[PDB]
Amino acid sequence: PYYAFAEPFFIHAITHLHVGSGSSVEEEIDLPFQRDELGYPTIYASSLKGAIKSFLLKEFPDKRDVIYKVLGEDENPEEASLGTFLDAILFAIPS
């Protein structure tokens, strides 16, 4: 029980997604999608956390303190955040 809760989830792209890795030199796709250490599309947990946290701080203005906890205080860190995202593995892609 190192982790209080563990919540796996699937991320279903409703519309098309663009999560960028910035411009590279070994790509011809100037705004590429975030790749993997194998070449598969990925969503870095920094991108997951940033999007979910920012979104959460707007849907739940009442529970702002609970989120500046587990996700992070976001202004002067002063403490590690209790939550943890894992880089989103590509499960299945429409081909």
Partner RNA sequence: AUUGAAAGUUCAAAGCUUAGAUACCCUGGAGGGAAACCAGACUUAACACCA
Contact positions toward RNA, by CB under 7 A? 18-23, 31, 44, 46-47, 49-51, 53-55, 71-74, 77-81
- Give the distance between the most distant pair of CA atoms in the chain: 46
Q: 76 or 95: whose CB is closer to RNA?
A: 76
* Distances 17 to 12, 14, 33, 80, 91 between C-alpha atoms, Å: 10, 8, 9, 30, 15
Least gap, CB of 64 to RNA (angstroms): 14
Least gap, CB of 40 to RNA (angstroms): 17
Contacts of 31 (CB under 8 A, 6+ apart): 18, 20, 23
**What six digits make up the tokens of 13?**
């792209």
Q: 2 or 91: whose CB is closer to RNA?
A: 2
Q: 51 or 95: whose CB is closer to RNA?
A: 51
